[PDB]
Amino acid sequence: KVFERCELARTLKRLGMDGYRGISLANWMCLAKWESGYNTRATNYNAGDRSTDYGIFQINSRYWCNDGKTPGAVNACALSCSALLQDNIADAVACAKRVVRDPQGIRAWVAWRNRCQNRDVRQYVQGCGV
Known part of the structure; x- marks a missing residue:
């Protein structure tokens, strides 16, 4: 399934992601956008360590x-x-949620550091009713 921006914003809010461990919905939206483009069946194989990133959040x-x-x-x-x-x-x-419960928090994902950290994530939830 490939979520539309606002559809995902509400689905994440309902699942209690808004402010989970101090992380706003906009950050989560920015993460999923850059990780998969909101596609739940996105996958990435890493030939170096033979691991694979799965889903909307590309979890390793x-x-x-x-x-x-x-x-x-x-x-x-x-x-x-x-x-x-x-x-x-x-x-x-x-x-x-389990991932951000660790030391790094949202920074666990390098893509977040690259395209969301200290960037304007407001744009990801505007108009979504969240």
Whole structure:
């Protein structure tokens, strides 16, 4: 499923992402936009460490979910990476929450640092009724 901006903004709000660990909805919108373009079935294989980024948030298999083919990987979200390719994003959000519960917080994703940090994210939720 590929969300439309405002449709995603409300779906994330309903799932309690607005201000989760101090992170605004706009930051989450900026993250999903740059990570997948709001596409829940987006995937990226990294040939260097044989890991794969799954879903709307491009969550990595080395640490967050199990796909059985990433060497010496862990499963912090206690999910099959398949759960991260669902049209329903509730599991991906539960995992994105797990990710920011760690030291780095939202900075865990380099793309966020690149295109959202200290940038104007206001534009991502304007008109969405959030």
